Structure formats: structure tokens, C-alpha cells
Design a protein around this ligand. Sequence first.
Ligand SMILES: CCCCCCCCCCCCCC(=O)OC[C@H](COP(=O)(O)OCC[N+](C)(C)C)OC(=O)CCCCCCCCCCCCC
Ligand SMILES: CCCCCCCCCCCCCC(=O)OC[C@H](COP(=O)(O)OCC[N+](C)(C)C)OC(=O)CCCCCCCCCCCCC
Ligand SMILES: CCCCCCCCCCCCCC(=O)OC[C@H](COP(=O)(O)OCC[N+](C)(C)C)OC(=O)CCCCCCCCCCCCC
Ligand SMILES: CCCCCCCCCCCCCC(=O)OC[C@H](COP(=O)(O)OCC[N+](C)(C)C)OC(=O)CCCCCCCCCCCCC
Ligand SMILES: [Ca+2]
Ligand SMILES: [Ca+2]
Ligand SMILES: [Ca+2]
Ligand SMILES: [Ca+2]
Ligand SMILES: [Ca+2]
Lengths: 219, 219, 219, 219
Amino acid sequence: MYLRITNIVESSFFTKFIIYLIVLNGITMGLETSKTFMQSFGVYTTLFNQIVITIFTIEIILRIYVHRISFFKDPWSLFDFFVVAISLVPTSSGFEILRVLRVLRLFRLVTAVPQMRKIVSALISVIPGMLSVIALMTLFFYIFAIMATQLFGERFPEWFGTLGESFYTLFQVMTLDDWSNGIVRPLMEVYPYAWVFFIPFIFVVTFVMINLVVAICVD
Amino acid sequence: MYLRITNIVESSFFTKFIIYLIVLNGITMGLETSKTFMQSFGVYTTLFNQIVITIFTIEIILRIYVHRISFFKDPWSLFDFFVVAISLVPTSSGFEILRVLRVLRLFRLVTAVPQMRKIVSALISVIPGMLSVIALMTLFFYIFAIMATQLFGERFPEWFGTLGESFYTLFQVMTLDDWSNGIVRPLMEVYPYAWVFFIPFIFVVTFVMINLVVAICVD
Amino acid sequence: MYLRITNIVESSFFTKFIIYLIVLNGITMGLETSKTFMQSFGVYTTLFNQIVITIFTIEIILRIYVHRISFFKDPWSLFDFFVVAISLVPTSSGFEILRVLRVLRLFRLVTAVPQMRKIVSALISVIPGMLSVIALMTLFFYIFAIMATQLFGERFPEWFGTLGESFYTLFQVMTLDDWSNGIVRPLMEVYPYAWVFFIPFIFVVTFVMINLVVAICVD
Amino acid sequence: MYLRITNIVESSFFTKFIIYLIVLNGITMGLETSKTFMQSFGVYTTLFNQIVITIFTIEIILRIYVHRISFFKDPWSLFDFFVVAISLVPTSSGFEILRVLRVLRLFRLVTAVPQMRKIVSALISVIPGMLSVIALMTLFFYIFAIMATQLFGERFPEWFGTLGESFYTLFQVMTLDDWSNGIVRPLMEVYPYAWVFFIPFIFVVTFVMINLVVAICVD
Ligand SMILES: CCCCCCCCCCCCCC(=O)OC[C@H](COP(=O)(O)OCC[N+](C)(C)C)OC(=O)CCCCCCCCCCCCC
Ligand SMILES: CCCCCCCCCCCCCC(=O)OC[C@H](COP(=O)(O)OCC[N+](C)(C)C)OC(=O)CCCCCCCCCCCCC
Ligand SMILES: CCCCCCCCCCCCCC(=O)OC[C@H](COP(=O)(O)OCC[N+](C)(C)C)OC(=O)CCCCCCCCCCCCC
Ligand SMILES: CCCCCCCCCCCCCC(=O)OC[C@H](COP(=O)(O)OCC[N+](C)(C)C)OC(=O)CCCCCCCCCCCCC
Ligand SMILES: [Ca+2]
Ligand SMILES: [Ca+2]
Ligand SMILES: [Ca+2]
Ligand SMILES: [Ca+2]
Ligand SMILES: [Ca+2]
């Protein structure tokens, strides 16, 4: 039977059947958005939803026998596993994000279409040659975040009161989002020299990010 | 008579005449903006406005006798057709945006003058090498738009209460516009972990976009 | 006498004597900024200014004898000339920006120092390649600015009430500056479909702009 | 004794011992952020701090013997000196920023780990071929910062009342932060033509910055 299923699973129709479900269940989830639609077709969809989870667990179970250890060593497969696994955790007990994280399964469209896998892989492959910079930056943030917590969090504890808060605020300044009226102008009303802290920060963090981009435009 | 008009249509003077009307009718539409001007010389304008549309339909009719099927397989010719057609629909009545969409005829300046054509073509021609990425993103937005609608739309239904609104808000965050004081900081007053949702979103979307930019430079 | 002065003008002293005044007059203009400093040494620096203005006319005259027609065909000299003329229009009458345009002379440091000219020239020489795009865009803006004036101007005259206002607001949206909370969201409280107008606009304008940037990477 | 310590200092254990301290002290400085943690274990980690600071001077004192004048001509070594030296200035007197500047020691993880060193060097090495542009801009700013101080600082002293404030506001405009609603729309309520000052400014500064980035994708 091994070769029987290995011919069922490895079949085009099998694959094309899965993709057809994903696009369908994907459509169905944009409908579960409507409060109106749920009051008219909620059950239609909730069963349709419970159905697909099996078909996908059936699929994932087959796929494992046909592949054994080769499966748990495949990124795309591992993914599909974990995503389907999340959707298996019962509706009620635990966190309620798990109900929401179910929609992560639409990323199977990525996993189950080679044209997607290409672009995704092409993207990810750039990350290794960025880790040195990414590490640098994180170290940088961490140092400034600490300085900021102890420079401004007594008078400005919403923004800088905690090391985590400073991280977020510093992130916000790095995206250049409402950084002067929204953050540094207020701070100067108490700390006139705060610009000595945030302008260099902006220079460094911006410089780094141009390199990181230009780094990518070479490799 | 074919070869008569074929020489009229293909004549330079024909083209230059058209290009002259466009830059003329263009200047007219900018004057039609002044409420003062219209109280003064509106009639002068509005009739001059109808005239141009006739000439341009005459022209478009001629250009069809001289090209037949080759016409309706030409983007630029199709454009002009679909643009002139709009401006032919009477001033009435259901949607009055049609009166406004008339100004799209000034894009004939692009269509008639080469070099413009050149640049527009060079711009457009970059698009197909991006579609794989665009589709990836659109799928991304769709997934997060859904997660957001059901994570935040009950307390925050201006921003997230509907799939469309979430699309809009997620777009706004992608342009990095007022994203932290304007949207995520509020949201954290109720949902402290909302940064777990938007910081990753920002990273992905930003990352993706840098690649897309660089992807263009490859070509 | 021609060759006598032609040896004075061409002299390293003369040229460096000028650069020396510019750096001096520049320092003095930032000093003229301090309301306090003017109450102490205002008349010093007021004379010192007219002094430099003579020396600079004396120079520009000598420079003309030595170069004649060649001088009025030099960008840097033409500039230097025009920036000195502005500083000569009496400290009164007409407009009083002329008192302020006098600070434009410190751009002589760009002229009087090579390398600077190198960089300014390197920068400028990129423009001609851009003009096809810059024309396309300007035509683009002009079309959309019209549509906006006549779509939002009656209810939103501060932002769109006049062709110029719409130009200004569209620019502000192009820089992605407070475009959604500050403009489109208000607009949608009256015109729910306004997103149909500004999202495409942003896509275009951002797309076009990336290409233009990538154009300057064709070198 | 020279060769003895020249073999201790130059040892792998020495380096990996120092790095182990940094990552340890670095963790300790994030914990000194928690006001809670300090009412409990503040004493432990305050002593732990002076301990590391001794070890770091011992280490720095050694390293100088083994290197002499070669040490003071090492960027990376000079740094470590300066940063350890700052942590030496007594926890009193002068300013309290010195206490905060102590956290700069965590940059030793950069100085004392290669790859980091490599990455930091790669970044810094791009700077020299930017100095001309940086100089151009810094000159540009200065001219406009002056022009703005005297065009807007009487009516708008918070933003432009002083050369420095104009520098600050002009920087903020350069990062495109809340530039139109936050600064220029207000300004046009008194100075309708102020757009003639900030739009050209934005073009120039943006243009230049695209080149500076394009430069780094040449060199
Ligand atoms: C790794 C590369 C990046 C390097 C940059 C990192 C260092 C940045 C320096 C931070 C600038 C200071 C920011 C801020 O002003 O600090 C706030 C505190 C308190 O200022 P304070 O004047 O005491 O405020 C009065 C407090 N009050 C009203 C409640 C009585 O203290 C200050 O206000 C006191 C004023 C200090 C100004 C002089 C600081 C110069 C440091 C420049 C860089 C040092 C060498 C690396
Ligand atoms: C390419 C995909 C990668 C991108 C990431 C995918 C999505 C990540 C999940 C986003 C996190 C959601 C943030 C959350 O604050 O949203 C609101 C929910 C609502 O549930 P709720 O329990 O009502 O929140 C607290 C209730 N309250 C405010 C009334 C006290 O509040 C939450 O339930 C709070 C509890 C969440 C704890 C942390 C969640 C861990 C998820 C991290 C990533 C998941 C695996 C990839
Ligand atoms: C490169 C060229 C790209 C072309 C795209 C640019 C032109 C797109 C037009 C933008 C759509 C209209 C924007 C905005 O909604 O306009 C306002 C009008 C009037 O709104 P209205 O619904 O009359 O509400 C008035 C409310 N009241 C009575 C209380 C004052 O609102 C209209 O009623 C909207 C009604 C639906 C409009 C649908 C038009 C989309 C198709 C046009 C695109 C085809 C050619 C590209
Ligand atoms: C090499 C690169 C150089 C870059 C170009 C430099 C740009 C400089 C242009 C300055 C624009 C002026 C902005 C602003 O309007 O300045 C304020 C003045 C005075 O306004 P004002 O008319 O007195 O308003 C009334 C004041 N009130 C109510 C208190 C009585 O407003 C004046 O009335 C302005 C006069 C109308 C426009 C005349 C300026 C256009 C000249 C453009 C620059 C010449 C070539 C570089
Ligand atoms: Ca912003
Ligand atoms: Ca903003
Ligand atoms: Ca705001
Ligand atoms: Ca606000
Ligand atoms: Ca921005």
C-alpha cells in the first residue's frame, strides 16, 4: 500500500486538490469576518472549517509516511505541520489567539505553489548576509534603550519608563514616525540637550540601514 | 478615399494639431478650476470644451479606418479610445464623477508625444518582474487584515472593524504614517501585546519592499 | 595693464583671499542672528558686510576684464555675479527678502572652492537624465490636482479649494506626511470612496519615484 | 616578565575571559533598569560593576605593556581606553551623564569580537567618500537655518527663533517628520509664500540624499 499512497500523494490531482481547498477556505475566512454573514451562514462555514482541518491532517499524515524522516527535515513541510497543528488545538481552552492564529494556514498557498516558494526563498536567502548588521543594531538599540530608561523614564515613563518601553520608543524614532513633535520636542521641554541623544541615534540607525540596503544590492 | 485619409491621419500636421489641442484643452481645464473664471468666461470655455471632444472623436474614428483591427490591439490607441469614450457620456446623471474623469484625457499628452510613451513603457515594463512579489504581499495583507479584524475590530472598529478598514489601516502602517502614536500606542492601552502584531508586520513589509526595490535594480 | 591684473586675478593669493572673506562673512552672518550680539557689535558687522560687498564687486569687475565674454558663459561666474547683484539692491524698497537673499552669497564657497564644484556638478549632471520622469510626474500631479480641486474643494477648501492648494496637499501626500490621519480619513468622513483616489496616487507616485532612484543607478 | 604577560594577554583565555565579562556586565546593566531588582539585588550588582571595572583597567594596563605606542595608535584600543576611563570618573561631581555613559562599555563586545569589528569597519570605511556631500549639506543647512531664522523666528520663535532651533526644525523637515501639518501649514497662516522656502529645501535635501545613497552603491 506504500506505493499505492505514494502515487496518490505524489499525484498532481492531490496537490491541485489541496490548493483548491486553501483558496476555498481562504475565501471562507474573509467571510467569517462579516458579523452579518455569520448570522446567516455561520454553521455552513464552521463545519466547512472543521472539515478542511481533517483533510489537511489526513494529507499531513499521508505525506509523512511517503516521506518519513525526509519530512521533518523539510522547512515547507514542517511549516504545514505546525500550522495545521495549531488549528488542531480545541476552540475553548488556552489562549484565544490560537483561534486567530488558525488563519496562518492560508500561508499554505505559499508552501503549496512553487512560484511562491521561489520568491519566498529568494527573500529569506538574503537574511544570512544581514545577521552581522542585524546583530550590530540590536546591540546598539539595547545600549541606547538602557541609556534612555535611565535618562528619561522618571519624567517620561510612558515612553522610556521601562527597558521594553524605551525599545519601542526607539524603534518608533527609527521609523522616523512622529519623532520630533511627538517625542523629542516634548522631551526637550525638560531635557534641553536630549537632541544630543536622538539626532546621533537617527544618523547611526539611518546610516546602518542604507548600508544594509546597499549590502543587499551587491550580493 | 482610404489612402486619402491614411495620408491625412499619418500626416505630421495631423498629429501636431492634436498635440496642440491637448496642451490647449489642458490649460482650459486648469482655468475651469477658478470659480471666478467660470463666472466670467465659462461659456467660452464650455463650448470650446465640447468642440475638442468632437474633433477628438472625429480623429479617433479616422484613426480606426486607417488601422482597423490593428487599432484595437494597440494599448495607446485603446487608451485614447477608452478615454475619449468617457468624455462622450453626457453630463448626466447617475455618477457625476464621469464629469471629473474627463480630465483623464490630458493623459493623451503622454500617448501622443513619444519620449513620454518611451518613459511610460520603460516604467510599466518593470511591473511583470514584480507580480510574484506583489501577489506575495497581497496575500500577506489579506492574512493580517483578517487577524486584525478579529483581534482589534470590536474595540477599535474605526481602524479594524471591517476587512476593508483593516486593509486601509494596515496600508497606513506600511507607509509608516503616524503608525505608533496614531494607531499602535492607542491599541496598546487595551491590548498591551499589540506590538507583537505590528512590529513583525512592519519588518516583513519593509524587508519585502527593500528587496522589491533591489529586485528592480537587478534588472 | 590687462596682463598686470590678469596676474593678480589668477593669483593663488587673490583666490584664497576671497575664500577667506567668504568664510569670514559667513561666520559673521550667523552672528548677526543673535539679537544679543547685534546689541553689542551690530555696527561693526554692518560695515564689515558692506566692505565685503565692495571687495566682491571689485573682484567681479576685475574678473570680467580678465575674462570678458568667457565670464558670462561660466555657470559659476554667472552665479557669483547674480548673487553679488542681489547683495547690491539697496537695503530698502521693493521686497525685504532681498535683505535675506543676501545670505545666498555663502554659496560662493561652493564656487570658490573646487571639489565642492566637483560634487555640485556631479549632482547637477544627473538632472537631464531625470527630466523625462520629472515631466511625466508634473503632468501627473497637474491632472490629479485638478480632479481633487473639483472633488474635494467645496467641502475641504483649506486642502483642495484651489488648484494650488491641491498641488500642495498632493505633494504632502507624496512625501507620505500625515497623509492618512491628517487627510484621507477626514476626507472619508464625507467621501467614503476617497481612498480610491489616494491609494492609486500613492502607488503611482511611489513606484515612479523608485524607478527614478534606480535610474540614478544606471551609471 | 614582559614575555610572560605577553603570553597571558595574547592568550585565547584572556580574550574569551574579557568577552565573558562584557556579556555578563551587559546583562547586569539591563537588570539595573528594574527598580524592583535594585531594591532586592542592587548591592550584588553594584559591587559586581566595580569588580569588572577593576579587571578592565588591569586588562587595559597589561595590554599597554604588551603593545606600548602600538596600542595608542589602535582605533579599537584607544576606544576601550576612553570607555573604561569614563567608567573610572567617580560616581559623583561634574555631571550625572557620566554614570550613564558607563553603559558605553558594552560596545567592547564590538571591539573585542571580530566580525563585529569587520562589520563596523566596513560601515565606517564608507564615510570618507561621503565627506564632500556631507560638507555640501552642512553648508546648505547653515545657509537656510540662517535664512529661516530671520524669515520666521519673530513669529515662530519655538521653531526658528534661534539658529540652533532652525537647525533642529530644518533637520525635522529633512526627515519629513510632520513637516506640512506640523510646521509649514501653520507657517503659511502668516507667511503664505513659505512654501517657496520649504518645498525647494525638500527637493534639494532629498535629491542629495538619494545621490549619497547612490554613491554608496558605486564605491
Ligand atoms: C556610541 C555613539 C553614540 C554616542 C552618543 C551617546 C551619548 C549621548 C549623550 C546624551 C545627551 C544628554 C541627553 C539629556 O540631556 O540628558 C538628560 C540628563 C539630565 O539633564 P539635566 O540638565 O540634568 O535636566 C534637568 C533635570 N531637572 C529639570 C529635572 C532638574 O543629562 C543631560 O541633560 C545633561 C546635559 C549633557 C550634555 C553633554 C553630553 C555630551 C555627550 C556627547 C557624547 C559623549 C562622548 C561619546
Ligand atoms: C509571518 C507570520 C509572523 C507574524 C506573527 C503572526 C501573528 C502574531 C500574533 C499577534 C499578537 C496579538 C496581540 C494581542 O494583543 O492582540 C489582541 C489579543 C486579544 O486577546 P485578549 O486575551 O482578549 O487580550 C487581552 C484582553 N484585554 C486587552 C481585554 C486584556 O490579545 C492577545 O491574546 C494577548 C496574548 C498574546 C500573547 C503573545 C502571543 C504569541 C504569538 C507570537 C507569534 C506566534 C507564532 C508565530
Ligand atoms: C493613472 C490614472 C488612475 C485613475 C484613478 C483616479 C480617479 C479615481 C476617482 C476616485 C474616486 C472618487 C473619489 C471620491 O469618492 O470622490 C468624491 C465623489 C463624490 O462622492 P459622493 O459619493 O458623491 O458623496 C457626496 C456626499 N455628500 C452628498 C454628503 C457630500 O465620489 C464618487 O461618488 C465615488 C463613487 C465611486 C467611484 C469609482 C470610480 C473608480 C473607477 C475610475 C477609474 C477608471 C479609470 C482609471
Ligand atoms: C541656490 C539654492 C537657493 C534655493 C532658493 C531659495 C529660496 C528663498 C525664497 C524665500 C521664500 C520666502 C518665504 C516667506 O514668505 O518669507 C517671508 C516673507 C515675508 O512675508 P510677508 O509678505 O511680509 O507676509 C506678511 C507678514 N506679516 C503678516 C507679519 C505682515 O515672504 C516674502 O513676502 C516672500 C516674497 C514672495 C516670493 C519671493 C521669493 C522668490 C525668490 C526665489 C529665490 C530666488 C533665487 C534663489
Ligand atoms: Ca510621519
Ligand atoms: Ca505624523
Ligand atoms: Ca499628529
Ligand atoms: Ca494630533
Ligand atoms: Ca516617513
